[PDB]
Each structure stands twice: as C-alpha cells, then as structure tokens.
C-alpha cells in the first residue's frame, strides 16, 4: 500500500581472484545482471582505497532541484565548500525528520521520498553537486601528481579506480581520439537527502559504474535493457512533454516517476541501497533512477566493453530515427581502432572486425542507392577534422563519418546517405558524395583486424 519496494537487484561478492580484473568479472556476471539492468558489487574486504580530503578546500557550484513526480527536469549540463554543503545537508535532514540523521531508517526515507514527490502541496527543493574532476574538486580515487602514501600508490593502477576505466585495454571508449570529456571522464556527485537522478539511460547505451566513496546510502531503481521500449511507452503516455523534439543534447528532458507505476504497467523494476564502499553497475540501455539517503559522495564513469559494440551500432541507428544528436561517431571509433589493429587486444580486434564487416556491407548498399538517385560526382573527405556541429545530417542530426552528401548550392551543409532528398532543391547531379574511405581502402583495414585476431 502507498509504496511497495521493488525486488532487490543481484548483489555480487567477488573473491580477490574474481575481482582483480573488472572486465572479466563484468563479463562473468552479465547473463545474470543484464536481466535486471543494475547490480551491486561488494569488493573483497581488504580492497579499501584510501579516502582523504580537506573539506574546507573542496568547493563546487550547487545545482538546485525541485522534487515533483512527472515534472520535466533538464539533464545535467557540464558556491559551497564540502564542509558547508555537509552542514546544510545534515541540518536539512535532521530538521525534516526531527531525528538524528543516521537514526532515520532507509525504508522511511524511501517511503517519504515517494510521498513528497507525488504530493502537489509539498514544495521541497534540494541542492546537489555534479561535475567532472577539476582543480577545485578532484577525483576521490588516487591520481598521479603531491607525494602519495604507499596505500595511495597501491590503488593508482587498480582496474576499479574509475580514472583508469577509460584508458584500459578491454575498454572501447578508450580509443576515441575525439575528446568527449563529458562522457569518458568520471563525474563527481555530492548528494544530500532526497537529491535525485531522474530516469535515464547512458549516452550511446553505454555501461556505467558508480562507486560510493563515503556517506549515507544511495537508493537505486533499475530496469533491464530488454524492457527499455516498454518503459518509454509508459513514460510517453504519462509524461508526453519529455518526448518533444529538442534543439540539442544540452536540452534533454527527464523526470521522476514512481517505480510502482512502471511495475503496474508490467515493467520489471529492481532496487538496491548502495552503501559506502560498494559499486553499482548499469548495463546497456538499462533505465535507472534513484536518490540519496543523506550527505554522501559518489564517483561514476561510462564505459564500453566488446559485448557492447553491436548495441552501440544499434543505438546510433535509433538516434537517427529519433533525430537525436550523437556524442561521437561510432563508425569513426571503429575505423580508428582498425587503423591501430597491430596494438589492439586480440579479443577486441576480433569483435571490432565483426562490427566493421556489418559497417562495410551497410555502407556498400547505401552508396549503391545514392548512385541510383543520380549522385555521380564524389571526393574524399576527412570527416574527423570537422567540428561535430559542422558534420551533422541536416535532417536526422547524425554525426557523419563514413560518407555524406553535399551541394555547392548549400555551402557547408551535409546530409547522411539516408537523407539525400533532404539537402536542397537542386537535382542530384549537382551533389557530391563525400566519403572517408573507398571500399578498396576498407577491406584491408578489416583484414588487419582479422590477422591480429588470428
């Protein structure tokens, strides 16, 4: 009645052997965890990264948040000290409940969150921190710089030190030479009671991993990737305003929604309370939302395994259908990796080769179609040199890389090969196919991957 907690998500307690390599571990739990969307990981008892900071010297700009179910909020776009925020946060919780903050049961905060967001007359606003590491507020994990203690040095190269997750070998966002800071760097999150993250999935359907360094728990709700479309259909019926087209990526709309509402509409939802020292991992296209139980500090990062590559391709297709902007070009990433085939991990090479084959066959068919539309002239074009906003399809906003159509009538404008008719009124013989590679360039690149994969 009123609020029924979703079933608990899977919780894993890996041995040190099982834990050592995060990518091997994630691959192992995937058949289980991808059915629930989120899972929790408790590191071995001895894995204990040192956490030290001067709460008076760390400062950040707070964001402010109203807490109303189904109200549109904008996705976080890229002054308190940690001490003064903590004082505010503790006093808020203490005053809200007239209790000391740790004697407030997590069950009660959860119950009260879902009451207050649903109740029109309640007008609770809270503040929180969200940004990438900076000189003003750095990573909670050890980074190289400051003479480090031996304990700190021990965690510098940990696979679970989230600063490393991008630049590692089984990672794929690693190789992106395009600098997508907002997506590949860890985000730092200072939370307070009820501060909340709305239902969302990660850009390009990536994984994410979140570590709670310190503080009171973080309550999560997650939905498996197989039910993403189900969830969106529920959202569109109850909150249509979230689905209107938007000028760019810095304008995405998201919302708070009771998981019981999703469960009523047959969407599977799981929950967990993430405590200090625990990881939460979200899987590709797994919707998630949640809120903080009190003053805390978390760090999170996106990543992409080899398992994810086919889903990445599907995601960009989905973005095209929605006319949504891309964070990066998937094809550019694939070709960058092929161009480095000799130094790729061999399983990575094998998986990239398979995606590349699909890319090449799709590209071959698209080029045949636009030739039949009367586009005859062509010229090589180094798309990777163009700023992203100078190589988006006028129609579907996809980031071009393999090819595009241009016309001297509309200088600087491009369409992708799905939208040749959307560029201008000139007849197609006035158009040029701009292409990064010939088919004859591409097959050798794919062959290099095959040789590396052996």
Ligand X SMILES: N#CC[C@@H]1C(=O)Nc2ccccc21
Q: How far is the CB of 70 from ligand X (least distance, A)?
A: 18
Of 282 and 398, nearer to ligand X (C-beta) is 282
Is 147 annotated as belonging to a binding site? no
202 is in an annotated binding site: yes
108 binds, among Na ion, Zn ion, ligand X, none (CB under 5 to 8 A by kind): none
Helix (H) or strand (E) holding 211: strand 207-215
State which residue, 282 or 392, has the beta carbon closest to ligand X. Answer: 282
Q: Is 210 labelled as part of a ligand binding site?
A: yes
User: Cα–Cα distance between 89 and 128 in angstroms, integer?
Assistant: 9
Q: Which residues pair with 41 in a beta bridge?
A: 12, 279
If the CB atoms of residues 28 and 42 are measured against ligand X, the closer one turns out to be 42
How many beta carbons lie within 10 A of that of residue 56, not counting itself?
Answer: 10
The residue (of 43 and 215) whose beta carbon lies closer to ligand X is 215
Q: Please, are residues 272 and 288 in contact by the beta-carbon 8 Å criterion?
A: no
The CB-of-351 to ligand X minimum distance in angstroms stands at: 26
For ligand X, give the closer residue by CB, 288 or 330: 288
Question: Strand 431-435 to strand 218-222: parallel, antiparallel, or no bridges (unpaired)?
Answer: unpaired
Helix then strand then coil, in percent of the chain rounded to 5, is 40, 20, 40
Q: Given the complex with Na ion, which of 52 and 120 has the nearer CB atom?
A: 120
Q: Which two tokens stand for residue 147?
A: 């003479």
For the CA atoms of the chain, what is the radius of gyration? 24
Residues recorded for the chain: 454
393 binds Zn ion (CB under 5 A): yes
Binding at 189: pick from Zn ion, ligand X, Na ion, none (beta carbon under 5-8 Å per type): ligand X
Sign of dihedral through CA atoms 283, 311, 260, 268? negative
Positions in the binding site for ligand X (CB under 6 A): 76, 130, 189, 197, 210, 218, 288, 298, 300
Residue 419 lies near Zn ion (rule: CB under 5 A)? yes
Using CB under 5 A, pick the residue from 8, 56, 107, 122 that binds Na ion. 122
298 interacts with, out of Na ion, Zn ion, ligand X, none, CB within 5 to 8 A per kind: ligand X
- 200 labeled binding residue: yes
Q: Please report whether residue 377 would count as binding Na ion according to CB under 5 A.
A: no
When CB distances are held under 5 to 8 angstroms depending on the partner's kind, the choice from ligand X, Na ion, Zn ion, none that residue 122 binds is Na ion
Residue 109: φ, ψ to 5°:
-60, -40
Residue 235 contacts which entry, Na ion, Zn ion, ligand X, none (Cβ below 5-8 A, type-dependent): none
In the complex with Zn ion, the residue whose CB is nearer, 150 or 412, is 412
Distance of CA 432 to the CA centre of its chain: 35
Q: Which residues contact 212 (CB under 8 A, 6 or more apart)?
A: 218, 274, 275, 276, 277, 278, 296, 297, 298
Using alpha carbons, select from 148, 283, 267 the residue that is nearest to residue 209. Answer: 283
Q: Which residues ranging from 56 to 75 are in contact with Na ion (CB under 5 A)?
A: 68
Query: Using CB distances below 5 to 8 A depending on partner kind, what does residue 210 bind out of Zn ion, Na ion, ligand X, none?
Result: ligand X
Q: Whose CA is closest to 408, among 426, 389, 390?
A: 426
Other C-beta atoms lying within 10 Å of the C-beta of residue 372: 9
Nearer to ligand X, 207 or 401 (CB): 207
CA angle at 301 for the pair 296 and 304, rounded to the nearest 5°: 155
Contact pick of 327, 396, 420, 442 for Zn ion (by CB under 5 A) = 396
208 is in an annotated binding site: yes
Residue 134 annotated as binding?
Answer: no
**Nearest approach, Cβ of 126 to Na ion (angstroms)?**
12
Minimum Å gap between C-beta 47 and Zn ion is: 47
The nearest distance, CB 66 to Na ion, in angstroms, is 8
Assign residue 70 a region (left: φ > 0; alpha: ψ between -120 and 50; beta: otherwise): left
Could you tell me the smallest distance in angstroms from the CB atom of residue 130 to ligand X? 5
**Residue number with the shortest CB distance to Zn ion?**
409
For residue 433, the cross-strand partners are 378, 405
String of contacts with Na ion for each residue 304-323, x by CB under 5 A: --------------------
Name the residue nearer to Zn ion (CB basis): 78 or 426.
426
Q: In this structure, is the dihedral angle defined by the CA atoms of residues 259, 264, 269 and 270, taken in order, positive or negative?
A: positive
Residues with Cβ within 8 Å of 22's Cβ and at least 6 positions away in sequence, in order, are: 159, 160, 165, 209
| C-beta separation of 331 from 359 below 8 A | yes
Residue carrying structure tokens 């959307």: 422
Which residues in this chain contact Na ion in the complex, by CB under 5 A? 68, 119, 122
Binding site for Zn ion (CB under 5 A): 393, 395-396, 407, 409, 416, 418-419, 424, 426
Q: Which residues are annotated as a binding site?
A: 128, 200, 202, 208, 210, 218, 288
Annotated binding residues for 2-oxoglutarate, written as ranges, equal 128, 208, 210, 218
């Amino acid at each position: 009645s009123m609020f029924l907690p979703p079933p608990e998500c899977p919780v894993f307690e890996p041995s040190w052997e099982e834990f050592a390599d995060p990518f091997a571990f994630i691959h192992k739990i995937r058949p289980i965890a991808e059915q629930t969307g989120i899972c929790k990981v408790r590191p071995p008892p001895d894995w204990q990264p040192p956490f030290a900071c001067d709460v008076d010297k760390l400062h950040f700009t707070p964001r402010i948040q109203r807490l109303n179910e189904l109200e549109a909020q904008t996705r976080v776009k890229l002054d308190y000290t940690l001490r003064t925020f903590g004082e505010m946060a503790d006093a808020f919780k203490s005053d809200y409940f007239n209790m000391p903050v740790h004697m407030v049961p997590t069950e009660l905060v959860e119950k009260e969150f879902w009451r207050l967001v649903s109740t029109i007359e309640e007008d609770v606003t809270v503040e929180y921190g969200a940004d990438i590491a900076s000189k003003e507020f750095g990573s909670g994990f050890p980074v190289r710089d400051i003479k480090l203690s031996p304990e700190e040095e021990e965690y510098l190269d940990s696979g679970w030190n989230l600063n490393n997750m991008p630049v590692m070998e089984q990672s794929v966002l690693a190789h992106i030479t395009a600098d997508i800071c907002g997506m590949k760097l860890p985000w730092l999150y200072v939370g307070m009671c009820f501060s909340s993250f709305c239902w969302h999935i990660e850009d390009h359907w990536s994984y994410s991993i979140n570590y709670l360094h310190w503080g009171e728990p973080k309550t999560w709700y997650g939905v498996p990737g197989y039910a993403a479309e189900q969830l969106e259909n529920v959202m569109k019926k109850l909150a249509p305003e979230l689905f209107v087209s938007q000028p760019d990526l810095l304008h995405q709309l998201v919302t708070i929604m009771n998981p019981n509402t999703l469960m009523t509409h047959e969407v599977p939802v799981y929950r967990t309370n993430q405590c200090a020292g625990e990881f939460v991992i979200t899987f590709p296209r797994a919707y998630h939302s949640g809120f903080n139980q009190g003053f805390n500090f978390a760090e999170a990062v996106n990543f992409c395994t080899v398992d994810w590559l086919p889903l990445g391709r599907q995601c960009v297709e989905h973005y095209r259908l929605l006319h949504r902007y891309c964070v990066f070009s998937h094809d550019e990433m694939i070709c960058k990796m092929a161009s480095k085939a000799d130094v790729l991990d061999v399983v990575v090479a094998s998986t990239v080769q398979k995606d590349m084959a699909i890319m090449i066959e799709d590209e071959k068919a698209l080029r045949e179609t636009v030739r039949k539309l009367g586009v005859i002239d062509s010229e090589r074009m180094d798309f990777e040199l163009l700023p992203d906003d100078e190589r988006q399809c006028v129609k579907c906003k996809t980031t071009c890389f393999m090819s595009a159509i241009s016309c001297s009538c509309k200088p600087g404008l491009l369409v992708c090969l799905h939208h040749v008719k959307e560029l201008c009124s000139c007849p197609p013989y006035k158009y040029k196919l701009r292409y990064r590679y010939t088919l004859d360039d591409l097959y050798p690149m794919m062959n290099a991957l095959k040789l590396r994969a052996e």
